[PDB]
Amino acid sequence: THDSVTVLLFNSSRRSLVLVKQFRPAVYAGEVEAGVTVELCAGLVDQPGLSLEEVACKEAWEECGYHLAPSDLRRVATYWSGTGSRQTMFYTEVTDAQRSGELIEVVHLPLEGAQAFADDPDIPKTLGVIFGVSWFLSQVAPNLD
Amino acid sequence: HDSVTVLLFNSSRRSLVLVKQAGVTVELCAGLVDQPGLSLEEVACKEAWEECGYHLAPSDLRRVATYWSGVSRQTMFYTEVTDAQRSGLIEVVHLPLEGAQAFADDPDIPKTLGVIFGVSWFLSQVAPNLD
Numbered sequence: 460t461h462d463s464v465t466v467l468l469f470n471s472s473r474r475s476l477v478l479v480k481q482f483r484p485a486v487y488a489g490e491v492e493a494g495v496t497v498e499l500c501a502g503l504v505d506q507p508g509l510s511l512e513e514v515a516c517k518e519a520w521e522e523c524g525y526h527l528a529p530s531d532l533r534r535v536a537t538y539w540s541g542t543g544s545r546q547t548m549f550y551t552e553v554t555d556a557q558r559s560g561e562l563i564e565v566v567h568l569p570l571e572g573a574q575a576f577a578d579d580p581d582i583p584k585t586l587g588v589i590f591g592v593s594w595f596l597s598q599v600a601p602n603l604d
Numbered sequence: 605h606d607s608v609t610v611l612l613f614n615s616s617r618r619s620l621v622l623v624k625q626a627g628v629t630v631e632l633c634a635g636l637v638d639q640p641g642l643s644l645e646e647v648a649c650k651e652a653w654e655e656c657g658y659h660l661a662p663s664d665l666r667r668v669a670t671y672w673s674g675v676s677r678q679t680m681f682y683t684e685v686t687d688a689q690r691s692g693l694i695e696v697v698h699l700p701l702e703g704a705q706a707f708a709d710d711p712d713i714p715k716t717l718g719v720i721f722g723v724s725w726f727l728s729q730v731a732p733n734l735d
Contacts (some may be wrong), residue, residue: 483672483675485672485674485675485676486672486675490679498675524642534697534711536708536709536711536720537711537718538714538715538716538717538719538720539714539715539716540631540716540717546717577669579667580670583671583672584672585670585671585672585673585675586669586671586672586673586678586717586718586721587717588671589669589671589721590717590720590721590724593721593724593725593728594724597724597728599629
């Protein structure tokens with residue numbers, strides 16, 4: 460086992476949340492009784508000698524194609540999963556100036572239809588996305604335009 | 605295999621009911637949709653009783669969200685309860701509302717995203733429309 464990090468980006472230049480779609484066999488196996496699950500950009504701390512926040516940026520870049528500075532990130536929460544791994548969620552505001560193996564497709568979720576999206580159970584999501592989408596709307600969205 | 609988690613609010617003590625399993629992790633009441641032909645909310649009621657010692661009816665449960673864990677499907681339920689709904693190796697925990705957000709924020713306390721989500725959701729969706 461290893462620790463991990465997830466990061467929720469908000470792109471103010473589109474009033475959108477940046478998420479990723481990824482294929483999970485478990486969801487496929489489940490729906491064969493698609494396979495494509497919306498998730499927060501994430502990754503494990505494989506590399507010995509890197510800030511959590513640095514792993515966040517690595518994955519912000521590799522998965523989502525966004526440039527990020529560790530200083531730009533703000534810790535949102537930290538928790539345990541599972542055999543168990545510590546995990547840390549980060550949030551940061553980005554703009555289009557920050558915008559540019561596996562099988563990951565980056566996604567943009569317009570704020571307007573975000574909550575509707577989180578609740579529609581026909582679209583596989585992770586708890587992360589749900590909390591991400593939730594925490595945002597309560598803690599950040601009221602302070603924005 | 606599917607699964608269910610359930611957040612309870614005890615009006616009588618103004619706490620949230622949680623569960624614990626220095627390796628102490630504070631979790632939401634939960635269990636697997638294990639047996640054939642059991643309604644999700646029934647599985648919730650079962651574990652609410654077996655784990656937490658609370659009597660619940662399926663009609664009390666509100667579906668807060670459904671999502672994927674493990675990468676298991678999972679459906680989270682909420683309901684208000686009172687001491688009247690309460691019986692007399694995990695150990696039940698009651699989190700007073702007044703310090704619930706802070707308890708959640710505190711990184712030096714092993715919680716789950718369930719708990720953190722639950723408190724965050726409860727405090728923004730239920731608490732304000734409450735007394």
